[PDB]
Amino acid sequence: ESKRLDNAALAAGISPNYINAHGKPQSISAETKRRLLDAMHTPVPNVMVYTSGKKMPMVVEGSGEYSWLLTTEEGTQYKGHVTGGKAFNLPTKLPEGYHTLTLTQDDQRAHCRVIVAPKRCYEPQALLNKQKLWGACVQLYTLRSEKNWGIGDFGDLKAMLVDVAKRGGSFIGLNPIHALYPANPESASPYSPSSRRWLNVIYIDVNAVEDFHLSEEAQAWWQLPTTQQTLQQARDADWVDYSTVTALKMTALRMAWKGFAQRDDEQMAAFRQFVAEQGDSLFWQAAFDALHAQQVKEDEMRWGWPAWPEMYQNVDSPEVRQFCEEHRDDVDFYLWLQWLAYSQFAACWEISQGYEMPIGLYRDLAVGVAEGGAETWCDRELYCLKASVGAPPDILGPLGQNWGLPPMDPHIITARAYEPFIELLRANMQNCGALRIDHVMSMLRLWWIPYGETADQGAYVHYPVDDLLSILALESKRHRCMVIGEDLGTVPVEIVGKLRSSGVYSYKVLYFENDHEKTFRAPKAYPEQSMAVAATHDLPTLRGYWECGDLTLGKTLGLYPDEVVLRGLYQDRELAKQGLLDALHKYGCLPKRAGHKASLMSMTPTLNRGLQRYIADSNSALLGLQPEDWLDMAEPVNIPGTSYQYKNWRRKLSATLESMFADDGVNKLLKDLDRRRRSA
Ligand SMILES: C[C@H]1O[C@H](O[C@H]2[C@H](O)[C@@H](O)[C@@H](O[C@H]3[C@H](O)[C@@H](O)[C@H](O)O[C@@H]3CO)O[C@@H]2CO)[C@H](O)[C@@H](O)[C@@H]1N[C@H]1C=C(CO)[C@@H](O[C@H]2O[C@H](CO)[C@@H](O[C@H]3O[C@H](C)[C@@H](N[C@H]4C=C(CO)[C@@H](O)[C@H](O)[C@H]4O)[C@H](O)[C@H]3O)[C@H](O)[C@H]2O)[C@H](O)[C@H]1O
Structure with a gap:
């Protein structure tokens, strides 16, 4: 349609086309362009980012002479003058950090935040020394143990760290532990969080809260047969019962809190210190959780702030303030829960480091927040609520995906001098050695879909990749937190080189590391700057893959409505399996007595081991192992593009930690894989 619309869309950073996952160009419709535009909101710029050790030109506009003052983060001052319409160079050898430049003419001043960044993200010494490391990538909620309350928690993480470290592992990788909704416990996706600044309180180990043990009331309640029976049903279930587990924990912790609240000691001081230091961000998280709890008491279907009375939808309204003043103790309780989770x-981090683990804990940062959570309640202007983030139609998800997450407006991120991005990294790089960036292509572009539409109606919107990657490297270095990018799906060629030279580690998924005729890449040909995995939480387990269970189940759940396309996927899987089997034999991961014809073979321990040896033998500096594959599990934990159709984020591991680490087979497998890492 019109050129007005086309130019406008282009000026807004909306791509008129893109290369799809099959390599074919696709065009964006005028309707999409219109709907997405509707969704979006002087002498020097407000922010400038530079790489350390390079020249730093600053262009000045206007006219006449300007005086300038640059104050570094540590407080060093530099002065000069420059003519409007000219450029000047910043003082040489500025240190990396966050600096302030101010230009003045007559009375009025203009400020530029000046960011000086290293080129590469952080790497631990072990990796710099070219060691090949391994770790366990787990979904925390899936872990079973003798002590947990029916969901894997921080106590399980602690116990597991020791078992991984004793066997030569260097890290435990986690799903996102962002705050979800204790008032709607069944909204359990870690990737639709309330806020990416705070933590999911369901992971609190209540056994480790002293005040739980000191409460007479709590212990009388814990001792009830009813309580013990509810607990045993929750623990025995093969699927996490989020409602029961949350009620158990909230009930216990509320009684613990009544005890803690009367303390006048170091513990109380530490809690208060923590609260004072974290400031408004923490306060508003707690206020949100207290309000949400009250609202679901009035009506359980009140899922987030858009379903609340208008008076509570505006975070700044006088009755929100009144609610907070009248429910000081409820707000206090939720502050306390964030303190416990944090602590x-x-x-867990401290223990990982006591065990000399080069990475220790590997956190995950989700690519967005839920529309009706605390983050959007607090800073509505930042998010484009009339669009949703997803992914375009692709190979294994031909309908595409709509994740329902309102995207950050890229112009507001830069207009705030990257503050929201910076704070996100500071929150998520604490107490860990590596951070996974979910859907790392987001640094360059996100698939925005008009609200309420199917994914095929979306388009790619531009983000300022060069600035974001520099800031990421800077924050990585300052936290000594390495960065691993999930660069999977429909990936723009432009970003691949930038991630590499920024020192971001790629994911190499065994299933996908083959060419156009299913010849699999040799283990020695895996790039060093990557993590090799057999699979992820978004993909079938080894057994599921082999059995085509993902395709069969996907079909049943509505993911593959085109039979011809589906038939193609089955055929390609059988070809892939054969190519994989050939490679396992070719590079010495299977004995000669193992079968050579994939169609006549089922998943066996020999094959299971062979597949994991293949990636253990690779040149990838990191290896991520799933416990589900040590246990030979068939069922997936998550099916992308489903919400209600499958019990996502619920499938427990089939054995406790205690039982898995006393199993001869598991112990032999991990010893073998660890020896292959140290030989490679
Ligand atoms: C699942 C992955 O998909 C894409 O990569 C895939 C790709 O699609 C696939 O073809 C395949 O590509 C392969 C390809 O097959 C191969 O031939 C090629 O050679 O290589 C490719 C790999 O490079 O593999 C990739 C990696 O898995 C992506 O590029 C990748 O980044 C993503 N992984 C990560 C990203 C997210 C982001 O959230 C997570 O998604 C997860 O969380 C989402 C949000 O909770 C989940 O969304 C669900 O829940 C939402 C609430 C729900 N939304 C509703 C709810 C609400 C309110 O509540 C409303 O507002 C909405 O309007 C409503 O519709 C969503 O509809 C539903 O889909 C999602 O299903 C789940 O997977 C993943 O776990 C994470 O690891």
Whole structure:
């Protein structure tokens, strides 16, 4: 349609086309362009980013002479003058950090935040020394143990760290532990969080809260047969019962809190210190959780702030303030839960480091927030609520995906001098050695879909990749937190080189590391700057893959409505399996007595081991192993593009930690894989 619309869309950073996952160009419709535009909101710029050790030109506009003052983060001052319409160079050898430049003419001043960044993200010494490391990538909620309350928690993480470290592992990788909704416990996707600044309180180990043990009331309640029976049903279930587990924990912790609240000691001081230091961000998280709890008491279907009375939808309204003043103790309780979660996760980090693990804990940062959570309640202007983030139609998801997450407006991120991005990294790089960036292509572009539409109606919107990658490297170095990018799906060629030279580690998924005729890449040909995995939480387990269970189940759940396309996927899987089997034999991961014809073979321990040896033998500096594959599990934990159709984020591991680490087979497998890492 019109050129007005086309130019406008282009000026807004909306791509008029893109290369799809099959390599074919696709065009964006005028309707999409219109709907997405509707969704979006002087002498020097407000922010400038530079790489350290390079020249730093600053262009000045206007006219006449300007005086300038640059104050570094540590407080060093530099002065000069420059003519409007000219450029000047910043003082040489500025240190990396966050600096302030101010230009003045007559009375009025203009400020530029000046960011000086290293080129590469952080790497631990072990990796710099060219060691090949391994770790366990787990979904925390899936872990079973003798002590947990029916969901894997921070106590399980702590116990597991020791078992991984004793066997030569260097890290435990986690799903996102962002705050979800204790008032709607069944909204359990870690990737639709309330806020990416705070933590999921369901992971609190209540056994480790002293005040739980000191409460007479709590212990009388814990001792009830009813309580013990509810607990045993929750623990025995093969699927996490989020409602029961949350009620158990909230009930217990509320009684613990009544005890803690009367303390006048170091513990109380530490909690208050913590609260004072974290400031408004923490306060508003707690206020959100207290309000949400009250609202679901009035009506359980009140899922987030858009379903609340208008008076509570505006975070700044006088009755929100009144609610907070009248429910000071409820707000206090939710502050306390963030303190406990924080403290317990910190204890896990400390233990990982006591065990000399080069990475220790590997956190995950989700690519967005839920529309009706605390983050959007607090800073509505930042998010484009009339669009949703997803992914375009692709090979294994031909309908595409709509994740329902309102995207950050890229112009507001830069207009705030990257503050929201910076704070996100500071929150998520604490108490860990590596951070996974979910859907790392987001640094360059996100698939925005008009609200309420199917994914095929979306388009790619531009983000300022060069600035974001520099800032990421800077924050990585300052936290000594390495960065691993999930660069999977429909990936723009432009970003691949930039991620590499920024020192971001790629994911190499065994299933996909083959060419156009299913010849699999040799283990020695895996790039060093990557993590090799057999699979992820978004993909079938080894057994599921082999059995084509993902395709069969996907079909049943509505993911593959085109039979011809589906038939193609089955055919390609059988070809892939054969190519994989050939490679396992070719590079010495299977004995000669193992079968050579994939169609006549089922998943066996020999094959299971062979597949994991193949990636253990690779040149990838990191290896991520799933416990589900040590246990030979068939069922997936998550099916992308489903919400209600499958019990996502619920499938428990089939054995406790205690039982898995006493199993001869598991112990032999991990010893073998660890020896292959140290030989490669
Ligand atoms: C699942 C992955 O998909 C894409 O990569 C895939 C790709 O699609 C596939 O073809 C395949 O590509 C392969 C390809 O097959 C191969 O031939 C090629 O050679 O190589 C490719 C790999 O490079 O593999 C990739 C990696 O898995 C992506 O590029 C990748 O980044 C993503 N992984 C990560 C990203 C997210 C982001 O959230 C997570 O998604 C997860 O969380 C989402 C949000 O909770 C989940 O969304 C669900 O829940 C939402 C609430 C729900 N939304 C509703 C709810 C609400 C309110 O509540 C409303 O507002 C909405 O309007 C409503 O519709 C969503 O509809 C539903 O889909 C999602 O299903 C789940 O997977 C993943 O776990 C994470 O690891």
